């Protein structure tokens, strides 16, 4: 449980690496053991944090690194859309892992539990006052709503992954900058594919930067190489 100040010191000017592989992906292992190696690679490279999904993966990663973890549990709650740490059940399991940050879908979309997002954020903060939280959002207003509700960090991971957000390819640098200017602790995340993009984003004065697929999804990296040849 690092203080926000201490965590901000740790994350500033560095790269957080998202080490995820869902069933169906080439690096998904039913018995685990792959994502911890990815996290180890990130640590050896000089990464300042890890983003990880699932109780299993988080625990395996904790076993090999002391880097702070942003943790999520991806689980569908149909008919509603959110799946990144969608209900208190996922929050509770993540709280039990003793990790630095819990990230969760904080979009404006209808929630399975019927709560408005601000109410849920307040509920989590009331239940776990000592837990730092990150709001995965898609739009500027969603970031503002989450911040006013008491979220510690606002992340841009869902921009381009909701129908009403920016659909264009590449990182949502306009959203990142706008949130930074508004005086919000921003963790830039989503579609950051090149070191050049990462530097541009870092220059905006973000609290942190998460790079995922560009480091830890060889399939997606290879696809981009292959596409350039067409």
UniProtKB/Swiss-Prot annotation:
Keywords: Carbohydrate metabolism, Isomerase. GO terms for cellular component: cytosol. Pathway: Amino-sugar metabolism; N-acetylneuraminate degradation; D-fructose 6-phosphate from N-acetylneuraminate: step 3/5. It is an enzyme of class 5 (isomerase). GO terms for biological process: carbohydrate metabolic process; N-acetylmannosamine catabolic process; N-acetylneuraminate catabolic process. It catalyses: an N-acyl-D-glucosamine 6-phosphate = an N-acyl-D-mannosamine 6-phosphate. GO terms for molecular function: N-acylglucosamine-6-phosphate 2-epimerase activity. Gene3D superfamilies: Aldolase class I. It comes from the Bacteria. Transmembrane segments: none annotated. Belongs to the NanE family. NCBIfam families: PRK01130.1. This is Putative N-acetylmannosamine-6-phosphate 2-epimerase. It comes from Streptococcus pyogenes serotype M1. The lineage of its organism: Bacteria, Bacillati, Bacillota, Bacilli, Lactobacillales. The gene is nanE.
């Amino acid at each position: 449980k690092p203080t926000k100040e201490k965590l901000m010191e740790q994350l500033k000017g560095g790269i957080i690496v998202s080490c995820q592989a869902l069933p169906g992906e080439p690096l998904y292992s039913e018995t685990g053991g792959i994502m911890p190696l990815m996290a180890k690679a990130a640590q050896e490279a000089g990464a300042v944090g890890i983003r990880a999904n699932s109780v299993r993966d988080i625990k395996e990663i904790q076993a090999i690194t002391d880097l702070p973890i942003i943790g999520i549990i991806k689980k569908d709650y149909p008919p509603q859309e959110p799946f990144i740490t969608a209900t208190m059940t996922e929050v509770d399991q993540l709280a039990a892992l003793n990790i630095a940050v819990i990230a969760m879908d904080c979009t404006k979309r209808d929630r399975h539990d019927g709560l408005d997002i601000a109410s849920f954020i307040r509920q989590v903060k009331e239940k776990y006052p000592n837990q730092l939280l990150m709001a995965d959002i898609s739009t500027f207003d969603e970031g503002l709503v989450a911040h006013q509700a008491g979220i510690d960090f606002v992340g841009t991971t869902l921009s381009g992954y909701t129908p009403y957000s920016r659909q264009e390819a590449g990182p949502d640098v306009a959203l990142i900058e706008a949130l930074c200017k508004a005086g919000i602790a921003v963790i830039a995340e989503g579609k950051i594919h090149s070191p050049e993009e990462a530097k541009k984003i870092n220059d905006l004065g973000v609290a942190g930067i998460v790079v995922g697929g560009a480091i830890t999804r060889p399939k997606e990296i290879a696809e981009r190489f292959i596409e350039a040849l067409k």
